[PDB]
């Protein structure tokens, strides 16, 4: 299960965050700052995998804004990367050429999509079109 998922920009600003572990607000902020410092202080050939606090912190940014995950040491690492790529593709398809500007303004839509896709750190739908159709149906309700 994904302990936490955070979408942060290269400048350090966070555009998305979703933690599945109940932690204190100050503790969560400190953990986020440490993760940003580690990711911001890492090269391009770090393998996109970090063992922070015994957690497989995987960093894979396809643009200026990066993505982060917190996977326990009980599953494969490539599965997290595949899930992140699938989520990015689904977000791009739902939005249509998703850029950084739409992420800040359309954070609610991204949060709803993430909730409908991943619940409790685990995946909810393996397909990519069924989730898009469900999100569209939910949005069309008004």
């Amino acid at each position: 299960m994904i302990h936490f998922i955070l979408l942060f920009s290269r400048q350090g600003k966070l555009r998305l965050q979703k933690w599945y572990i109940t932690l204190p607000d100050k503790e969560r902020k400190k953990i986020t700052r440490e993760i940003v410092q580690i990711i911001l202080s890492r090269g391009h050939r770090t393998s996109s995998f970090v063992d922070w606090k015994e957690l497989k912190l995987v960093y894979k940014r396809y643009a200026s804004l990066y993505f982060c995950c917190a996977i326990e040491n009980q599953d494969n690492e490539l599965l997290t990367l595949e899930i992140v790529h699938r989520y990015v593709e689904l977000l791009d398809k739902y939005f249509g050429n998703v850029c950084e500007l739409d992420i800040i303004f359309n954070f609610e839509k991204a949060y709803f999509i993430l909730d409908e896709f991943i619940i409790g750190g685990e995946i909810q739908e393996t397909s990519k079109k069924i989730a898009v159709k469900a999100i569209e149906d939910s949005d069309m309700l008004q």
Partner: peptide, 10 residues
Amino acid sequence: KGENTSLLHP
């Protein structure tokens, strides 16, 4: 800028 660019460019 670098923000208006697509996440994957697809």
